[PDB]
Amino acid sequence: GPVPSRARVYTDVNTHRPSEYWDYESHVVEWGNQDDYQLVRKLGRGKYSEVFEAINITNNEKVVVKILKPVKKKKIKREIKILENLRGGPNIITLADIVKDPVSRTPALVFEHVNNTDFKQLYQTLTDYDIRFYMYEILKALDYCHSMGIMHRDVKPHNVMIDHEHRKLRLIDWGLAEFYHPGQEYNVRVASRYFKGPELLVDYQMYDYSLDMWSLGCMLASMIFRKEPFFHGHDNYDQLVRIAKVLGTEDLYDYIDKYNIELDPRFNDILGRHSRKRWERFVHSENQHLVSPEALDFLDKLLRYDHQSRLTAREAMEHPYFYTVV
Numbered sequence: 515g516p517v518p519s520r521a522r523v524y525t526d527v528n529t530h531r532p533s534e535y536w537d538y539e540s541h542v543v544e545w546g547n548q549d550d551y552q553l554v555r556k557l558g559r560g561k562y563s564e565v566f567e568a569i570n571i572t573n574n575e576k577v578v579v580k581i582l583k584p585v586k587k588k589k590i591k592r593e594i595k596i597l598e599n600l601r602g603g604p605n606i607i608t609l610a611d612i613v614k615d616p617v618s619r620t621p622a623l624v625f626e627h628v629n630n631t632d633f634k635q636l637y638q639t640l641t642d643y644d645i646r647f648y649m650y651e652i653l654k655a656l657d658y659c660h661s662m663g664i665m666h667r668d669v670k671p672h673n674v675m676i677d678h679e680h681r682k683l684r685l686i687d688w689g690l691a692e693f694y695h696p697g698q699e700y701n702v703r704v705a706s707r708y709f710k711g712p713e714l715l716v717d718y719q720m721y722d723y724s725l726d727m728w729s730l731g732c733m734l735a736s737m738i739f740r741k742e743p744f745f746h747g748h749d750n751y752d753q754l755v756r757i758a759k760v761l762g763t764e765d766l767y768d769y770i771d772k773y774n775i776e777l778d779p780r781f782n783d784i785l786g787r788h789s790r791k792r793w794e795r796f797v798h799s800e801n802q803h804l805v806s807p808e809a810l811d812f813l814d815k816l817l818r819y820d821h822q823s824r825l826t827a828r829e830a831m832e833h834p835y836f837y838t839v840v
């Protein structure tokens with residue numbers, strides 16, 4: 515069978531902690547009163563919830579109400595527990611209340627409001643400094659949650675709220691997040707296609723925090739090269755082919771050999787043979803002002819097939835790319 519793996523950092527943080535911390539199924543959830551909140555407008559609507567801008571009438575403060583859709587109760591509890599565990603953490607969205615609609619008993623999470631500056635307007639006005647700055651704010655959020663035994667598992671632009679005017683960043687959507695237990699075999703059907711790490715695509719279940727580091731690399735690549743998404747796959751099998759067209763097929767076979775992984779036969783006719791492309795080949799007139807040797811060196815250290823070979827959030831924070839922010 516496949517070779518076992520464990521995280522290089524924060525490996526045993528949950529083991530040495532009491533069951534109360536990580537046992538979300540046993541955690542007691544206390545539902546507040548929805549009448550303290552007046553719904554203003556729809557903010558978004560994902561595949562798991564409906565999100566509304568609201569006012570807490572008891573202060574006149576702006577909040578965000580995330581109504582939750584038909585899902586496994588286990589998952590709802592897990593999200594609540596992780597949020598409560600991470601509450602107060604740097605650049606972690608703050609869960610302010612847990613409420614249930616008196617009539618239909620629909621669960622809803624109440625968060626601090628973030629004035630999310632337009633994503634289509636941001637992409638065009640961000641400078642080399644802004645990218646380094648916001649990448650560092652995400653790293654503070656990841657180093658923190660990884661240190662608390664949690665992997666986000668859905669790191670992407672849509673899960674990152676930025677109030678550019680106040681230079682404030684929040685990592686949101688903790689619905690797919692999970693407690694890291696060394697040796698545990700996790701579901702690979704997590705994260706969004708474009709940001710899925712190779713481990714998920716080759717069905718390698720014993721993954722860890724490093725999954726978030728791959729997703730972060732995909733975001734950085736898309737930001738400095740102005741190509742969204744960076745790895746544009748049409749499906750989960752095609753997604754790996756897209757990575758292979760960049761990282762090459764030689765290092766891919768080295769990866770699956772190191773962990774004794776068996777490639778699904780769907781890959782037989784689509785993988786092909788690909789040479790490793792130099793990161794510099796992605797530099798163009800439209801993006802050259804966001805690219806630097808340090809950016810390329812940093813990106814190269816995030817986008818590795820081998821999850822164990824990738825920089826940790828702490829190692830990433832120490833990289834020369836962050837000297838101008840740090």
Ligand SMILES: O=P(O)(O)O[C@H]1[C@H](OP(=O)(O)O)[C@@H](OP(=O)(O)O)[C@H](OP(=O)(O)O)[C@@H](OP(=O)(O)O)[C@H]1OP(=O)(O)O
Nearest residue numbers: 739740741742743744745746747748749752755756757759
């Ligand atoms: O959208 P897909 O079919 O998945 O493929 C995309 C798409 O090009 P095409 O759609 O025309 O093949 C992108 O274009 P947009 O749809 O985003 O306009 C393009 O990037 P650009 O946005 O710069 O055009 C990108 O890469 P490239 O243009 O280098 O082909 C390319 O990816 P694939 O080449 O992997 O299909």
Ligand SMILES: Nc1ncnc2c1ncn2[C@@H]1O[C@H](COP(=O)(O)OP(=O)(O)O)[C@@H](O)[C@H]1O
Nearest residue numbers: 557558560561562563565578625627628672687
């Ligand atoms: N704290 C928040 N501040 C501002 N907008 C938010 C906030 N939380 C969620 N949203 C908006 O709602 C969308 C969906 O929220 P999210 O937690 O990511 O739910 P889902 O898991 O269903 O995708 C976001 O992408 C964003 O547009």
Ligand SMILES: CC[NH2+]Cc1ccc(-c2ccccc2)c(Cl)c1
Nearest residue numbers: 633636645648671672674733737
């Ligand atoms: C709908 C919310 N999206 C907002 C958003 C915009 C830009 C980035 C970003 C910033 C710096 C580097 C790479 C990406 C992110 Cl993560 C999220």
